[PDB]
Amino acid sequence: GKNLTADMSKLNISAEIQLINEIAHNVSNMRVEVEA
Amino acid sequence: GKNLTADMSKLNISAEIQLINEIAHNVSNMRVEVEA
Amino acid sequence: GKNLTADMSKLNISAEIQLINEIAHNVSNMRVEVEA
Amino acid sequence: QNVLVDDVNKLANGFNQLTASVSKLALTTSSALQAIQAVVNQNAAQVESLVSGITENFGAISTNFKVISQRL
Amino acid sequence: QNVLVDDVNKLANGFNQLTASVSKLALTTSSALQAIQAVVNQNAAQVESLVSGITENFGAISTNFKVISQRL
Amino acid sequence: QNVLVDDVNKLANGFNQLTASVSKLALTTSSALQAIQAVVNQNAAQVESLVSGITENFGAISTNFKVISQRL
Ligand SMILES: [Cl-]
Ligand SMILES: [Cl-]
Ligand SMILES: [Cl-]
C-alpha cells in the first residue's frame, strides 16, 4: 500500500476581515450634516 | 487501531447572504432625481 | 467492505472575483471635482 | 453661483452611479458567498460519508483477522 | 435657484443613507468571511486528524499480516 | 444661499471619500474571495488524492486475505 499524507491548506484572511471592519468604521463616520 | 470520527463543521451564512441581498435592494432604490 | 468514492465539489467564483475587481475600478474613477 | 447648479447635477449623477455599483457589489458578493456555502457544506458531507465507509472497511478487516486467528 | 437648496438636502440624506448601508454591507461581509474561515480551517484540521488515525490503522493491519505470515 | 456653496464642497469631499472606500471594500472582498477559492479547491484535491490512496491500501489488504485464505 501507500503512505497517505494530507497536507491541508489553511485559510488566512484575518487581514482582509480586519481591513473590512476598518472600512465599516470609517464609513458611517461619514455623515454629512448641514445648515445653522 | 483507532476509532475514526469526522465531526465536520457546516457553514451557515444564510442570514448574511440574505441581509446583503436586502442591502442591494435598499441601495439602487436610492436614485436621486431633481428639477421640474 | 465498501467502494469509497469522493466526488468533491470544486469552487468556481472567478466571475464574481473579476466582476468585483471591475466594480473597484469603475468606482475610484468616480471622483467628482468642481469650480474653475 | 452658476456652478452650483452644475455641481448639484454632477453629484446627482455620481451618486446614482455609486449606488448602482454598490448594488452590483452587494449582489456579486452575495453570489460568491452562496457558492462558497454550497461547496464547503457538500465537501464536508462527502468527508463524513467517506469516514463511515472507511469505518465499515476497518470493521470487516478486523473481523477477518479474528476469524483467521482463531481458525488457526 | 430655489431647488438648489432642496437638492442639497436630498443629496445629504441620500449620502447618509448610502454610507449607513455601505457600512452594513462591509460588516455583513466581514461576518460571512469570519464564519467561512472558521469552518474551512476546522474541516481541514479534522481531515488531518483523520489521516493520522487512518495511518495508525493501516500500520496495525500491516503488523497483523506480518505476524501471521511468519507465524504460519 | 451662502451655505449652498459650502454644502456642495462638503458633499463633494464626502462623495470622493465614499467612493475611495467602496473601492477599497471591493478589492478587499475580492482578495478574501480569491484566498477562499484557492484553499477550498486545494483541500478538495487533497481529499480526492487521499481516497485514491486509501483505495489502493484496501485493495492490497483484500489481496492479502485472499492469498492467505486459500493458501491455508
Ligand atoms: Cl453574478
Ligand atoms: Cl450580522
Ligand atoms: Cl489586501
Author numbering:
A (entry chain F), B (entry chain F), C (entry chain F): 1024 to 1059
D (entry chain C), E (entry chain C), F (entry chain C): 767 to 838
Extract from the study:
Virus entry of CoV is mediated by its spike (S) protein, where its S1 domain facilitates attachment to host cells, and its S2 domain is involved in the subsequent fusion between the virus and host membrane. During the fusion process, two heptad repeats, HR1 and HR2, in the S2 domain, assemble into a six-helix membrane fusion structure termed the fusion core.
HR1s from three HR1-L6-HR2 (SADS-CoV) molecules are arranged around the crystallographic three-fold symmetry axis and also form the central hydrophobic core in an antiparallel manner, resulting in a six-helical bundle structure with dimensions of ~107 Å in length and 30 Å in diameter with a left-handed supercoil. The HR2 helices make five full turns and pack into the central HR1 trimer to form a highly stable six-helix bundle conformation that coordinates the fusogenic events between the virus and host cell membranes. A structural comparison between SADS-CoV and SARS-CoV-2 fusion cores revealed a high degree of overall structural similarity with a root mean squared deviation (RMSD) of approximate 0.814 Å for 71 Cα atoms of a piece of HR1 protomer. Only three-pair polar side-chain to side-chain interactions were detected between the helical region of HR2 and HR1 of SADS-CoV.
